[PDB]
Every structure is written in C-alpha cells, then in structure tokens.
Symmetry: D2
Subunit: 106 residues, 4 copies
Amino acid sequence: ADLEDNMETLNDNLKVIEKADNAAQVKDALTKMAAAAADAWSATPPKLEDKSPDSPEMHDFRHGFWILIGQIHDALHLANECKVKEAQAAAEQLKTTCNACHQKYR
Amino acid sequence: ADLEDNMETLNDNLKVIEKADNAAQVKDALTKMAAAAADAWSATPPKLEDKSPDSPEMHDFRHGFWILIGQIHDALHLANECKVKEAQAAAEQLKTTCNACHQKYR
Amino acid sequence: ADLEDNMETLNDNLKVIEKADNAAQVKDALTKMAAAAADAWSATPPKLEDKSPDSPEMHDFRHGFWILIGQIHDALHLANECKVKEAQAAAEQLKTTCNACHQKYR
Amino acid sequence: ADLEDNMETLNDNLKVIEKADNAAQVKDALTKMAAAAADAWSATPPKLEDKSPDSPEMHDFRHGFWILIGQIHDALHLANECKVKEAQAAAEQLKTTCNACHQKYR
Ligand code: HEM
Ligand code: HEM
Ligand code: HEM
Ligand code: HEM
Ligand SMILES: *C1=CC(=O)N(CCN2C(=O)C=C(*)C2=O)C1=O
Ligand SMILES: *C1=CC(=O)N(CCN2C(=O)C=C(*)C2=O)C1=O
Ligand SMILES: [Cu+2]
Ligand SMILES: [Cu+2]
Ligand SMILES: [Cu+2]
Ligand SMILES: [Cu+2]
Ligand SMILES: [Cu+2]
Ligand SMILES: [Cu+2]
Ligand SMILES: [Cu+2]
Ligand SMILES: [Cu+2]
Ligand SMILES: [Zn+2]
Ligand SMILES: [Zn+2]
Ligand SMILES: [Zn+2]
Ligand SMILES: [Zn+2]
Ligand SMILES: [Zn+2]
C-alpha cells in the first residue's frame, strides 16, 4: 500500500493495542503494523520527493523504519509470551520512534 | 516484487559484496538486499500455501525475515564506517539465516 | 560496579551527550554507558530482593537492559558515522527505556 | 568472572541446549550465557593486551559481543514461547558469531 495508508494502519493498530483485553488481539495488531512498516520501506516522503534514493536523507529516512520494525518484532515476542501489559507498554514506547521520524521528515 | 525475485536480489547482491572493492559498492548491495527483504515480508511460501496468515508457521516464517533485516541493518552501518572487510564478513554471516529459513520452508 | 553506580554513569553520560560538540565526545559517553549497562546486568534491584534469579520479574528486569544495550549499540554506530545530531537524539530517545524500567522496578 | 571463564560458560551451556528435552532447560542455559556475555564485555583479549580501549580493534572486539547478546536475547524469547526446537536452532546459529570472533581475536 501507499505511505499515508501504511501510517493509518500503524495509527489504527496502536489504538487497538492500547485498548485490547487479551493477547490474541495484541498479536494481531502488531502483525499488521509489522507488514505496514515493511511495506513503508520503499516509499519516498513528500519532503524529499526530489532527492535520490541515496541522499544521506533517504538513508536516514529508511533507518527509522528499521528501528520501528525491530521494536514491533520485540513487542510481538512479548505478546506470544502472554505478557499482555508488557506488550502494550512496548507499543506505547514506539511512539518515541514515530514522533522522531515525523519531526524530521513529515 | 515476487518472492523468487526477491531471493535472486538477495543472492545476486551477496556475491556483489563478496567480490566488492570499496565501501560504496557494499553499501549499494546491502541497500538492495534491505529493500528485497522488506518486500519479501508479505509473501507466502509454496510449502505453506494452505495455512492462513496466522498459523505458528506463518508467524515463524516471517520471523526469519526480521532476523535478516536486523542483520542487513547492521552490516550497512559497518559499510558506512569505511570498514569494508567487516561488512563483508557480516554479509557472509547472514547466510546462516538464509540457510536456516530454507531448510524449514523451501 | 554496583547498580546505583551504574545508573549514575548512565545519567552523567546522557548529559555529556546532550551538550557535546563533536563525534569523539559522543562516542566516549556511549562507550561508558555501554559498559555500565553490561555491568548492570547481573544486579538485583531492591524491589525484588524477594524473588530468585528466575522470577518472571527478574527475567523482565533483565529484559529492559537488552533493550538499552541494543539502543546504545545503535547510537554508537551513528556516532562512528559522524552523525552527531542523529546520535544525540538516539540518545534522547533512550530515556523511554530508562523510564520504562524505573516505573516498574525502582 | 574472567574471560576464559565466561567462554567456558558459553560453551558448556551451548551443549546443555543442544541436548535439552524441555523448554525450561533451554531458558536456563541461555540465561547463563547472557550473563556470561554481558560480563565478558569489559574484557581485554590477550592478542590486544597493549592497545588502549579506544583502538578500532577494541571497538570491533566489543562489537561481536553486542551481536552475541542480541542473538541470546532473541533465542530466549523463542524458549519462553515454548518453541524448544526453534530455540535450539537459534543457539546453533550463534556459532557463526563465536567463530567469527575467534578467527579474528583468539
Ligand atoms: C509509529 C508507530 C508511527 C505512527 C503511529 C505514525 C503515524 C502517522 C500518521 C497518523 C500520519 C498521518 C497524519 C495524517 O494523515 O493526517 C503519519 C504520517 C507520516 N509518517 Fe508516520 N507514524 C509512525 C511512524 C513513522 C516513522 C517511523 C516514520 C519514519 C521513519 C514515519 C514517517 C511519516 C511520514 C513521512 C508521514 C507523512 C507522509 C505524508 O503525509 O505524505 N512515520 N504517520
Ligand atoms: C539470505 C540472504 C537469502 C538468500 C541468499 C536466499 C536465496 C534463495 C534462492 C537462490 C532461492 C532460489 C529458488 C529456486 O532456485 O528455485 C530462494 C528461495 C526461497 N527462499 Fe531464500 N534466501 C535468503 C533468505 C531467506 C530467508 C531469511 C527466508 C525465510 C524467511 C527464505 C525463504 C525462502 C523460501 C521459502 C524459498 C522458496 C521459494 C521458491 O523456490 O518458490 N530465504 N532463496
Ligand atoms: C537510561 C540510560 C537510564 C538512566 C539515565 C537511569 C538513571 C537512574 C537514576 C538517576 C537512578 C537513581 C540513582 C540516584 O538517585 O543516585 C536510577 C536507579 C534505578 N534504575 Fe535506572 N536508569 C536508566 C536505565 C535503567 C534501566 C534500563 C533499568 C531496568 C531495566 C533501570 C532500573 C533502575 C532501578 C531498578 C533503579 C533503583 C534501584 C536501586 O538500587 O535503588 N534503569 N536509574
Ligand atoms: C559463542 C557462543 C562462543 C563460544 C561457545 C565461545 C567459546 C570459547 C572457548 C571454549 C574458548 C577457549 C577458552 C580457553 O582459552 O581456555 C574461547 C576463547 C575465546 N573466545 Fe570465545 N566463545 C564464544 C564467543 C566469543 C565471542 C563473540 C568473542 C569475541 C567477541 C570471543 C572471544 C574469545 C577470545 C578472545 C578467546 C581466547 C581467550 C583466551 O584464550 O584467553 N568468544 N571461546
Ligand atoms: C568511511 C570512513 C571515512 O572516513 N569516511 C568519511 C569520513 N567520515 C567520517 O569519518 C564520519 C562521516 C564521514 O564522512 C567514511 O565514509
Ligand atoms: C502462551 C501464553 C500462555 O500463557 N500459554 C500457556 C503456557 N505456556 C507458555 O506460557 C509458554 C509455553 C506454554 O505452554 C501459552 O501457550
Ligand atoms: Cu505498499
Ligand atoms: Cu491506498
Ligand atoms: Cu491512499
Ligand atoms: Cu488509502
Ligand atoms: Cu567477570
Ligand atoms: Cu576464574
Ligand atoms: Cu579463571
Ligand atoms: Cu576459571
Ligand atoms: Zn525482547
Ligand atoms: Zn553493530
Ligand atoms: Zn542503526
Ligand atoms: Zn566446563
Ligand atoms: Zn525474534
């Protein structure tokens, strides 16, 4: 999907996680966020529409997505361990990464 | 791109790295390998054409890709620090991941 | 060194990074922070004086340190690439991990 | 503990894992390996007895330990998830990191 699409999936599922009861729900939202962050990898954000896929800026843009994926990766391990609250907190702590990218590139 | 496609890109660029001279070329192959692993995320491998995108087998399939992406992520940092040999050895060490997935799922 | 000791080193060096000018200084503080987090691993926090080194509470306690070590690991790659600001900021985003552990275990 | 000590703990527990019948056992060996790897962080290997802690060689030495720790971290999530065989295989694939460091620095 497109960039703004993937972002919505990220945002919608964050909320699903905030409010979830049980591990199953959390696993699911995380799985969708994971796919969304992976698909987002290829994108070019408007603010650097011109630049080439080699700018220190594209390389730094894409870096924030490795961080995100690493973190979704780990949050999900917690969910598989039935550590519902610990996973929910890992999800809350992702926002730091979301915000970090947004302040630079959005 | 398709899954066999992405696998070719992975395998072609591993050779490019094996034989490369200087930092710049290594960076490039890894970058291409990164994109390929990210796209490969959403894929369903023939051996699991039946199971839904939730079976412990799909979750495990995709797990192997987080491992690889993390490892490509790190080799590329090495390439940026002008440590070329270190980066090729990280590249060679990846294979341990390639092989691991292949003998479960290929 | 002791737990509170290591925490001081973590906190002191965070500030050193906040205010640093150039790559070299950032590398140093992170290096010191790395060693402090690694040494912190074996520690038992007062609040879990009650639990053996196998409680889902010690394992979770130690988990927070893997997160931090990974994050120090990555900040430092940034510093080696001379990306001073990018590093300083990775450093800022760490606090999310500090805070997360403190809220649970301090 | 000392460096050769930590290496024994790593090697002994690798075996314990290769042998191990049930998940509880695997968790234990990995936990011991993680502690060992963390404590090994601060060590200076004979081959680099002279060099200051700031040589690209000490930096690279310690780097191999972050890799190791990252992989022990992950293998343990597999164990908590009751996936015994997958954890065993993550453990075997660690050897790649052991060997990599030994060929350079042992
Ligand atoms: C992390 C979990 C995360 C969230 C959540 C998130 C949300 C988000 C929203 C809701 C938008 C759009 C606002 C709107 O459409 O009105 C948005 C947009 C962008 N994001 Fe984002 N985002 C998260 C993560 C990240 C990360 C990690 C990056 C970079 C590494 C990133 C980047 C962007 C960009 C660029 C946009 C705007 C694109 C556009 O509008 O054309 N996001 N995000
Ligand atoms: C790691 C860098 C990596 C490489 C290299 C690689 C190569 C590769 C090749 C050459 C094929 C060829 C198929 C053919 O000739 O018919 C192939 C196919 C598959 N792969 Fe792969 N692969 C690497 C990594 C990984 C990882 C990390 C996974 C699992 C997450 C994985 C899986 C698969 C699967 C399944 C196939 C079968 C697809 C098919 O033949 O239709 N690979 N790969
Ligand atoms: C992250 C880099 C980080 C910082 C910074 C930090 C700071 C810190 C302070 C300032 C104290 C109080 C000491 C004093 O007043 O003299 C403190 C104490 C504890 N910490 Fe911490 N800490 C950081 C990281 C982490 C992480 C990642 C964890 C757990 C996984 C953690 C835990 C604790 C605990 C527990 C204490 C109190 C225990 C005690 O012996 O009093 N910290 N930290
Ligand atoms: C990975 C899990 C791993 C294992 C296993 C391992 C084992 C090991 C043994 C058995 C020895 C020999 C001990 C002796 O000299 O009596 C040994 C020695 C060294 N190792 Fe090791 N080691 C593993 C991992 C790693 C890693 C990741 C590094 C470096 C980053 C590393 C280093 C060393 C070094 C140096 C030695 C020699 C020290 C000495 O002989 O005094 N090991 N290891
Ligand atoms: C790899 C080694 C190197 O020196 N360079 C250029 C120098 N440089 C840094 O050391 C940090 C940013 C930078 O440009 C490399 O690219
Ligand atoms: C997954 C979460 C949960 O609690 N259970 C039951 C017990 N169990 C584990 O927690 C890990 C392996 C195991 O059987 C789950 O299966
Ligand atoms: Cu898309
Ligand atoms: Cu769309
Ligand atoms: Cu759209
Ligand atoms: Cu749309
Ligand atoms: Cu020791
Ligand atoms: Cu001893
Ligand atoms: Cu001894
Ligand atoms: Cu001894
Ligand atoms: Zn974890
Ligand atoms: Zn690294
Ligand atoms: Zn990085
Ligand atoms: Zn022994
Ligand atoms: Zn994992």
